[PDB]
Amino acid sequence: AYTLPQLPYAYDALEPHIDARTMEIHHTKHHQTYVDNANKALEGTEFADLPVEQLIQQLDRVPADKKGALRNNAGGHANHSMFWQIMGQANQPSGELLDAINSAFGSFDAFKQKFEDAAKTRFGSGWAWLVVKDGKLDVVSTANQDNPLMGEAIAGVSGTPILGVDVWEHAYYLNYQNRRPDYLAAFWNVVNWDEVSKRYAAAK
Amino acid sequence: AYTLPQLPYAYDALEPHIDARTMEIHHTKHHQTYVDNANKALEGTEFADLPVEQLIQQLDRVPADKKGALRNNAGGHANHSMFWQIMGQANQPSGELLDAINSAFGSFDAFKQKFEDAAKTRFGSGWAWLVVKDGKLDVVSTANQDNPLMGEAIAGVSGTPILGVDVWEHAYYLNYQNRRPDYLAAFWNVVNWDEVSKRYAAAK
Ligand SMILES: [Mn+2]
Ligand SMILES: [Mn+2]
């Protein structure tokens, strides 16, 4: 019941910041694998009809033998699905999103630093996120394919994510090798703040 | 305290199974970073002089605030140090190690399938290991830089590792990209079974 989404842009649209080969393998190999394995785990359950963002808020009610596979693979599908949409071909937010950033973090610059720190500090595989929690913004990180929508019990953090960065080594190894900070610096050039703004509006 | 060990062979000695560029980055960048961060954590403590494989067996004795840094960083140093030594330039074990493999797994071919399965199913970053536990061989995996020497409470598995394979994406992405199974198949060509036999003798 899940399918791989098409990207909103061509595989080379984000060069030189994110290389075309990475975009192609990340989408057509990594993300495809999560969709396929999530579908396998959903076979013959009552959950095969739920949108993926709703399924991952309900992991405590799936059968115990399928919890891990669904956490990992539905999590992977939800996470990559959002990631493609929040990127696009002095890039900064505006309007009420900028105001909420100023309020929570002091400035856009201070926000970038907190976000990069969270991404750099995540040991092994995972993601860093900007989330809305009780109408306020915060920066959290998760392991592997965990997503703050899963809740504190599972993911260790909570909130509705409106922006995320993938720091699995597959997201940056071909262009940046070990240099995660360089990848994070380039990432700011490709964030679609219009899309993040839309997500913020719908999260409060 | 700790220092980065010299490799027992040139960076290009394992071609074409593992590429020279990866060997260089894996050693001088990734492994160096674990050494540096472990040294920072161990400064001016009674623990700074212990061999690393002894330290990771005693993580319960260290100050509570240093446990996390040492698990990740002394773990990474211990893991990579062993990794370089168990590779060298069809390849299979002999003698009493081969007999032990036959006894525990049925055959060397059956052991390879079990080891590859453990390494394939480790989600995210980690390692797969052949361990000796109560005189018998078994195959286990660990997350991130955990090592079975840390014990079941920390690593979730136990035993003395005699062979391990790194399945962090940095270990294989440049040459294999998403194809972790092709990397594992290549890895059999570079195992130094004489060294593994040595470790088996010491651990039994
Ligand atoms: Mn990814
Ligand atoms: Mn490694």
Say which CATH number the domain at A188 has. Answer: 3.55.40.20
Spatial CB neighbours of B184, under 8 Å, sequence gap ≥ 6: B115, B116, B119, B120, B165
Say which CATH number the domain at A42 has. Answer: 1.10.287.990
Pick left, alpha or beta for residue B156 (phi over 0 → left; psi -120 to 50 → alpha; otherwise beta).
left
Pick left, alpha or beta for residue B151 (phi over 0 → left; psi -120 to 50 → alpha; otherwise beta).
left
Q: Count the neighbouring beta carbons within 10 Å of the beta carbon of residue B64.
A: 7
- Residue ending a domain, among B88, B108, B137, is B88
DSSP B106: S
Residues B198, B125 within the same domain: yes
With tokens 């698990």, the residue in question is B71
Handedness of CA B57, B63, B69, B73 (dihedral sign): negative
**Considering the domain boundaries, does residue B182 fall inside one?**
yes
**Considering the domain boundaries, does residue A2 fall inside one?**
no
What is the Cα–Cα distance from A189 to A171, expressed in whole angstroms? Answer: 16
Spatial CB neighbours of A95, under 8 Å, sequence gap ≥ 6: A197
Spatial CB neighbours of B172, under 8 Å, sequence gap ≥ 6: B22, B179, B180, B183
Q: Do B178 and A25 touch (CB under 8 A)?
A: yes
**Partner A, chain B 2-61, Cβ-Cβ below 8 Å:** 25, 29-30, 33
Residues B97, B171 within the same domain: yes
Burial class (CB in 10 A: 0-12, 13-18, 19+), B65: exposed
**All residues with CB under 5 Å from ion ligand 1:** A 166, 168, 171
Q: Is the peptide bond before B16 cis (omega within 30 degrees of 0)?
A: yes
**Considering the domain boundaries, does residue B176 fall inside one?**
yes
Spatial CB neighbours of A20, under 8 Å, sequence gap ≥ 6: A11, A12
Q: Please give the backbone phi and psi of residue B129, each rounded to the nearest 5 degrees, phi first.
A: -140, 145
Q: A4-34: string of b/e by CB count within 10 Å (b at 16+)?
A: beebeeebebbeeebbbebbebbbeebbbeb
**Considering the domain boundaries, does residue A81 fall inside one?**
yes
Three-state SS for B25? helix
What is the Cα–Cα distance from A152 to B59, expressed in whole angstroms? Answer: 27
Residues A101, A197 within the same domain: yes
Total structural domains in chain A?
2
Beta B160-166 vs B126-133: how paired, if at all?
Answer: antiparallel
Residues A105, A204 within the same domain: yes
**Considering the domain boundaries, does residue B152 fall inside one?**
yes
Do B86 and B190 touch, CB atoms closer than 8 A? Answer: no
**Considering the domain boundaries, does residue B204 fall inside one?**
yes
CA of B171 from ligand 2 middle (Å) equals 6
Handedness of CA A170, A173, A174, A180 (dihedral sign): positive
Q: Does A168 touch chain B (CB under 8 A)?
A: yes
Spatial CB neighbours of A41, under 8 Å, sequence gap ≥ 6: A66, A69, A70, A73, A74
Q: What is the 3-state secondary structure (H, E, C) of chain A?
A: CCCCCCCCCCCCCCCCCCCHHHHHHHHHHHHHHHHHHHHHHHCCCCCCCCCHHHHCCCHHHCCCCCHHHHHHHHHHHHHHHHHHHCECCCCCCCHHHHHHHHHHHCCHHHHHHHHHHHHHHCCCCEEEEEEEECCEEEEEEEECCCCHHHCHHHHCCCCEEEEEEECCHHHCHHHHCCCHHHHHHHHHHHECHHHHHHHHHHHC
What is the Cα–Cα distance from B3 to A108, expressed in whole angstroms? Answer: 40
Both tokens assigned to B54: 């002894």
CA of A169 from ligand 1 middle (Å) equals 8
Alpha-carbon A107 to chain mean position? 23
Q: Please give the backbone phi and psi of residue B120, each rounded to the nearest 5 degrees, phi first.
A: -70, -35
Chain A environment of B25 (Cβ under 8 Å): 177-178
Which of A33, A143, A169 faces B169 most closely, judged by CB atoms? Answer: A169
Residues B163, B136 within the same domain: yes
- Residue ending a domain, among B88, B106, B129, is B88
Which of A29, A72, A178 faces B123 most closely, judged by CB atoms? Answer: A72
What is the Cα–Cα distance from A190 to A87, expressed in whole angstroms? Answer: 5
DSSP B64: G
* CA quadruple B48, B49, B50, B55: dihedral, nearest 10: 10
- Residue ending a domain, among A61, A88, A115, is A88
Three-state SS for B102? helix
* CA neighbor of B168 nearest in space, from A73, A121, A144, A147: A144
Range of the domain at A72: 19-88
Residues B94, B77 within the same domain: no
Residues A95, A170 within the same domain: yes
Residues A94, A61 within the same domain: no
* CA quadruple B139, B143, B144, B149: dihedral, nearest 10: -60
**Considering the domain boundaries, does residue B14 fall inside one?**
no
* Helical ranges in chain B per DSSP H: 20-25, 32-42, 52-55, 67-85, 95-105, 108-121, 152-155, 173-176, 180-187, 193-203
Spatial CB neighbours of B204, under 8 Å, sequence gap ≥ 6: B132, B135
Residues A127, A57 within the same domain: no
Q: Please give the backbone phi and psi of residue B25, each rounded to the nearest 5 degrees, phi first.
A: -65, -45
Residues B104, B204 within the same domain: yes
Question: Which amino acid is it at A186?
Answer: A
* CA neighbor of B150 nearest in space, from B80, B91, B204, B74: B74
Do A139 and A161 touch, CB atoms closer than 8 A? Answer: no
Alpha-carbon B104 to chain mean position? 21
Any idea what the Cα angle at residue B156 is, between residues B154 and B157, rounded to 5°?
Answer: 115
**Considering the domain boundaries, does residue A5 fall inside one?**
no
Residues B127, B52 within the same domain: no
Concatenate the DSSP letters of all residues of B171-199 into one string: GTHHHHTT-HHHHHHHHGGGB-HHHHHHH
With tokens 């990740």, the residue in question is B72
What is the Cα–Cα distance from A94 to B5, expressed in whole angstroms? Answer: 51
Residues B46, B84 within the same domain: yes
